[PDB]
Design a protein around this ligand. Structure first.
Ligand code: HEM
Ligand code: HEM
Ligand SMILES: [C-]#N
Ligand SMILES: [C-]#N
Lengths: 130, 123
């Protein structure tokens, strides 16, 4: 009896569509994030839906088109501070709230994302964070 | 190919691409003054950075630590005009090394976004 994939567990394609569209809504309004993103977030949102789908055990949509994610490498030119990693996760938390993602699948997905976001950090903190 | 680094032609292509690029930089009046007179060490690091960025070996971070790319560019007066000059030199370098098609558009669009992020001084 097949357990559901995390992708299935979270609600599948329909949930990822709404989560990511909602997510980048928060990103576009966040002062710590919006400046480093492209002005139009459409292509970014499209790509993120492909990534999260495959990331959660759905079809390999991202790799099929774009090749290996190698996300840390792809984020190297961008100023990703621990502060911005925190803003990213904050927006995702709010998107998950808005999209009704809860329980064990929420904790599963959020904890993976938190680990990934930490991996992306490539610039040290501002004064105060020691 | 599974990585941009492979797709673009790998190490040999990055070599000629970056060597060519800094030839154009050295001749560009909007850029040459803020670069070192000798661009050897700069070209070396850029080959490391582009290699790792496009999915090759982690040459850059292994030697130099975290990228913190914008921070490394803060001490230089990088205007939008200079970002344009930078991208113009890269365009020519790509033409000269035969980088075309989708891999060209892929890499150039990412470099253009990056160059915009480096800007730290108004025109
Ligand atoms: C930690 C804070 C992060 C910041 C500040 C950040 C910022 C950015 C920016 C500015 C881009 C460029 C958008 C584009 O070129 O289309 C990007 C691309 C991308 N990021 Fe993030 N990112 C972060 C973390 C993450 C995380 C946790 C994930 C996990 C899903 C992720 C997945 C992606 C993907 C799939 C792309 C598209 C790359 C491509 O194929 O061109 N990023 N990121
Ligand atoms: C937007 C216009 C840009 C200007 C005017 C500019 C200018 C400079 C200058 C003057 C240096 C110092 C060179 C040295 O001290 O050896 C430097 C370093 C560097 N730049 Fe740029 N740059 C620009 C964009 C970029 C972009 C788009 C990239 C993408 C890879 C990049 C990657 C690097 C790297 C890897 C270094 C070496 C950092 C180190 O010392 O470890 N730069 N840049
Ligand atoms: C990355 N969003
Ligand atoms: C910098 N080139």
């Amino acid at each position: 009896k097949q357990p559901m994939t995390p992708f299935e567990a979270i609600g599948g394609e329909q949930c990822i569509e709404i989560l990511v569209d909602t997510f980048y809504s928060y990103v576009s309004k966040h002062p710590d994030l919006s400046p480093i993103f492209p002005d139009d977030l459409t292509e970014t949102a499209r790509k993120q839906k492909q990534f999260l789908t495959q990331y959660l055990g759905g079809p390999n949509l991202y790799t099929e088109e774009h090749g290996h994610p190698m996300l840390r490498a792809r984020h190297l030119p961008f100023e990703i501070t621990p502060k911005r990693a925190e803003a990213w996760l904050s927006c995702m938390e709010q998107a998950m709230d808005d999209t009704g993602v809860h329980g064990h699948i929420r904790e599963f997905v959020f904890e993976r994302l938190a680990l990934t976001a930490q991996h992306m950090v490539n610039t040290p903190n501002e004064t105060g964070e020691i």
